[PDB]
Amino acid sequence: ATFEIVNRCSYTVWAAASKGDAALDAGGRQLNSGESWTINVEPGTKGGKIWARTDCYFDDSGSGICKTGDCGGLLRCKRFGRPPTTLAEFSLNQYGKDYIDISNIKGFNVPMDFSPTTRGCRGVRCAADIVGQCPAKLKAPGGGCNDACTVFQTSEYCCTTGKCGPTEYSRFFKRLCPDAFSYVLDKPTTVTCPGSSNYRVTFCPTA
Secondary structure, three states, X not given: OEEXXXXXXXXXXXXXXXXXXOEEEEEEEEEOOOOEEEEEOOOXXXXXXXXXXXXXXXXXXXXXXXXXXXXXOEOOOOOOOXXXXXXXXXXXXXXXXXXXXXXXXOOEOOOEEEEEOOOOOXXXXXXXXXXXXXXXXXXXXXXXXXXXXXXXXXXXXXXOOOOOOOOHHHHHHHHHOOOEEOOOXXXXXXXXXXXXXXXXXXXXXXX
Protein backbone atom coordinates (compact mmCIF):
# COMPACT_ATOMS: atom_id res chain seq x y z
CA ALA A 1 0.00 0.00 0.00
CA THR A 2 1.35 3.45 -0.76
CA PHE A 3 0.86 6.33 1.61
CA GLU A 4 1.79 9.85 0.68
CA ILE A 5 2.38 11.95 3.84
CA VAL A 6 2.08 15.67 3.04
CA ASN A 7 2.89 18.56 5.29
CA ARG A 8 0.55 21.48 4.44
CA CYS A 9 1.41 23.21 7.79
CA SER A 10 3.31 26.49 7.66
CA TYR A 11 5.79 24.89 10.10
CA THR A 12 8.11 21.88 9.65
CA VAL A 13 6.98 18.57 11.07
CA TRP A 14 8.88 15.33 11.50
CA ALA A 15 6.58 12.67 10.12
CA ALA A 16 6.54 9.24 11.77
CA ALA A 17 5.19 5.86 10.69
CA SER A 18 5.22 2.77 12.92
CA LYS A 19 3.32 -0.41 13.84
CA GLY A 20 4.47 -0.19 17.50
CA ASP A 21 7.14 -2.90 17.33
CA ALA A 22 8.67 -1.77 14.01
CA ALA A 23 9.05 1.18 11.66
CA LEU A 24 6.86 1.39 8.58
CA ASP A 25 9.19 2.15 5.67
CA ALA A 26 11.96 4.50 6.96
CA GLY A 27 9.92 5.23 10.12
CA GLY A 28 10.37 8.98 10.08
CA ARG A 29 11.61 12.00 8.19
CA GLN A 30 11.76 15.78 8.35
CA LEU A 31 8.97 17.33 6.24
CA ASN A 32 9.31 21.02 5.59
CA SER A 33 6.18 23.05 4.75
CA GLY A 34 4.79 21.68 1.49
CA GLU A 35 6.95 18.52 1.39
CA SER A 36 5.53 15.08 0.55
CA TRP A 37 6.99 11.74 1.65
CA THR A 38 5.86 8.57 -0.12
CA ILE A 39 6.05 5.33 1.88
CA ASN A 40 5.20 1.71 1.22
CA VAL A 41 3.32 -0.21 3.91
CA GLU A 42 3.31 -4.00 3.69
CA PRO A 43 -0.18 -5.48 2.88
CA GLY A 44 -1.79 -7.09 5.93
CA THR A 45 -0.25 -4.49 8.33
CA LYS A 46 -2.41 -4.40 11.50
CA GLY A 47 -2.32 -1.40 13.84
CA GLY A 48 -0.16 0.95 11.78
CA LYS A 49 -0.07 4.63 12.68
CA ILE A 50 1.19 7.82 11.05
CA TRP A 51 1.65 11.03 13.00
CA ALA A 52 3.44 14.38 12.97
CA ARG A 53 6.07 15.37 15.52
CA THR A 54 6.62 19.10 16.21
CA ASP A 55 9.62 21.18 17.25
CA CYS A 56 12.24 18.45 16.87
CA TYR A 57 16.00 18.43 16.96
CA PHE A 58 18.02 15.56 15.53
CA ASP A 59 21.77 15.14 15.20
CA ASP A 60 23.68 13.46 12.27
CA SER A 61 23.05 9.99 13.87
CA GLY A 62 19.24 10.42 13.84
CA SER A 63 19.09 10.85 17.67
CA GLY A 64 17.25 13.74 19.26
CA ILE A 65 13.93 14.84 20.73
CA CYS A 66 10.51 16.23 19.68
CA LYS A 67 8.22 18.44 21.70
CA THR A 68 5.24 16.25 20.64
CA GLY A 69 5.11 12.67 19.42
CA ASP A 70 8.70 11.68 20.32
CA CYS A 71 9.36 7.96 19.64
CA GLY A 72 12.26 7.24 22.02
CA GLY A 73 14.45 10.10 20.76
CA LEU A 74 14.82 8.66 17.23
CA LEU A 75 14.34 10.34 13.84
CA ARG A 76 13.38 6.94 12.36
CA CYS A 77 10.52 5.72 14.60
CA LYS A 78 10.30 2.06 15.57
CA ARG A 79 7.73 2.57 18.35
CA PHE A 80 4.68 4.80 18.90
CA GLY A 81 5.00 8.45 19.82
CA ARG A 82 4.63 10.22 23.09
CA PRO A 83 1.27 12.06 23.41
CA PRO A 84 -0.08 14.53 22.40
CA THR A 85 -0.30 13.06 18.91
CA THR A 86 -3.14 13.22 16.40
CA LEU A 87 -3.11 9.70 14.87
CA ALA A 88 -3.86 8.35 11.39
CA GLU A 89 -4.58 4.67 12.20
CA PHE A 90 -4.92 1.82 9.77
CA SER A 91 -5.13 -1.96 9.43
CA LEU A 92 -4.73 -3.18 5.84
CA ASN A 93 -6.17 -6.32 4.19
CA GLN A 94 -8.25 -7.41 7.20
CA TYR A 95 -10.69 -9.99 5.85
CA GLY A 96 -10.49 -8.39 2.37
CA LYS A 97 -10.83 -4.74 3.39
CA ASP A 98 -8.68 -1.88 4.73
CA TYR A 99 -9.79 0.04 7.84
CA ILE A 100 -8.77 3.63 8.50
CA ASP A 101 -9.52 6.18 11.14
CA ILE A 102 -8.22 9.26 12.88
CA SER A 103 -7.88 9.10 16.65
CA ASN A 104 -7.61 11.70 19.44
CA ILE A 105 -7.23 8.91 22.06
CA LYS A 106 -3.57 9.99 22.46
CA GLY A 107 -4.46 13.69 22.27
CA PHE A 108 -3.94 16.11 19.44
CA ASN A 109 -0.95 18.03 18.14
CA VAL A 110 -1.52 18.83 14.44
CA PRO A 111 -4.74 18.85 12.35
CA MET A 112 -4.98 16.01 9.82
CA ASP A 113 -6.86 14.65 6.83
CA PHE A 114 -6.53 10.93 6.06
CA SER A 115 -8.04 9.98 2.73
CA PRO A 116 -7.82 7.25 0.11
CA THR A 117 -6.15 8.26 -3.19
CA THR A 118 -7.75 5.26 -4.97
CA ARG A 119 -11.52 4.63 -5.40
CA GLY A 120 -14.17 3.05 -3.15
CA CYS A 121 -14.43 4.87 0.18
CA ARG A 122 -14.11 8.32 1.75
CA GLY A 123 -11.63 10.07 3.95
CA VAL A 124 -11.74 11.39 7.50
CA ARG A 125 -10.52 14.65 8.91
CA CYS A 126 -9.82 16.29 12.24
CA ALA A 127 -8.90 19.87 11.40
CA ALA A 128 -10.42 21.94 14.18
CA ASP A 129 -8.25 24.22 16.37
CA ILE A 130 -8.12 21.70 19.21
CA VAL A 131 -4.84 23.12 20.56
CA GLY A 132 -6.28 26.65 20.80
CA GLN A 133 -9.50 25.37 22.43
CA CYS A 134 -7.76 22.83 24.68
CA PRO A 135 -9.14 22.64 28.29
CA ALA A 136 -6.58 24.08 30.72
CA LYS A 137 -5.92 20.72 32.41
CA LEU A 138 -5.07 18.99 29.12
CA LYS A 139 -2.75 21.63 27.67
CA ALA A 140 0.70 20.18 27.14
CA PRO A 141 3.68 22.52 27.96
CA GLY A 142 5.71 21.36 24.94
CA GLY A 143 2.63 22.14 22.83
CA GLY A 144 -0.53 20.25 21.89
CA CYS A 145 -3.55 18.94 23.79
CA ASN A 146 -3.11 15.76 25.85
CA ASP A 147 -5.83 13.18 26.21
CA ALA A 148 -7.14 12.74 29.77
CA CYS A 149 -5.63 9.23 30.16
CA THR A 150 -2.13 10.68 29.65
CA VAL A 151 -2.83 13.44 32.13
CA PHE A 152 -4.66 11.60 34.89
CA GLN A 153 -3.94 7.88 34.52
CA THR A 154 -7.31 6.68 35.76
CA SER A 155 -9.29 3.57 34.78
CA GLU A 156 -12.12 5.78 33.49
CA TYR A 157 -9.94 7.68 31.04
CA CYS A 158 -7.57 4.85 30.11
CA CYS A 159 -10.36 2.27 29.76
CA THR A 160 -8.68 -0.48 31.73
CA THR A 161 -11.37 -3.22 32.09
CA GLY A 162 -12.94 -2.03 28.81
CA LYS A 163 -15.60 -0.46 31.12
CA CYS A 164 -15.53 3.27 30.59
CA GLY A 165 -17.87 5.89 29.24
CA PRO A 166 -17.49 9.34 27.64
CA THR A 167 -16.14 12.10 29.88
CA GLU A 168 -16.03 15.91 29.94
CA TYR A 169 -12.61 15.53 28.27
CA SER A 170 -13.56 12.99 25.60
CA ARG A 171 -16.64 15.15 24.74
CA PHE A 172 -14.33 18.14 24.11
CA PHE A 173 -12.42 16.17 21.43
CA LYS A 174 -15.67 14.81 20.01
CA ARG A 175 -17.33 18.24 19.83
CA LEU A 176 -14.36 19.68 17.85
CA CYS A 177 -13.72 16.53 15.76
CA PRO A 178 -16.76 14.26 15.49
CA ASP A 179 -15.01 12.08 12.87
CA ALA A 180 -12.11 11.04 15.16
CA PHE A 181 -12.12 8.59 18.12
CA SER A 182 -12.43 10.62 21.34
CA TYR A 183 -12.04 7.77 23.83
CA VAL A 184 -11.36 4.00 23.73
CA LEU A 185 -15.03 2.89 23.52
CA ASP A 186 -16.20 5.72 21.30
CA LYS A 187 -18.76 4.74 18.58
CA PRO A 188 -16.24 3.79 15.79
CA THR A 189 -15.57 6.42 13.11
CA THR A 190 -13.60 3.78 11.16
CA VAL A 191 -13.94 3.86 7.36
CA THR A 192 -13.95 0.57 5.40
CA CYS A 193 -11.94 0.82 2.20
CA PRO A 194 -11.25 -1.73 -0.58
CA GLY A 195 -8.32 -3.96 0.32
CA SER A 196 -4.95 -2.66 -0.92
CA SER A 197 -6.06 0.99 -1.37
CA ASN A 198 -3.52 3.88 -1.45
CA TYR A 199 -3.83 6.85 0.94
CA ARG A 200 -2.74 10.36 1.69
CA VAL A 201 -2.22 11.74 5.19
CA THR A 202 -2.15 15.54 5.04
CA PHE A 203 -1.09 17.60 8.05
CA CYS A 204 -2.91 21.00 8.30
CA PRO A 205 -5.31 20.20 5.42
CA THR A 206 -7.12 23.56 5.63
CA ALA A 207 -3.97 25.70 6.15
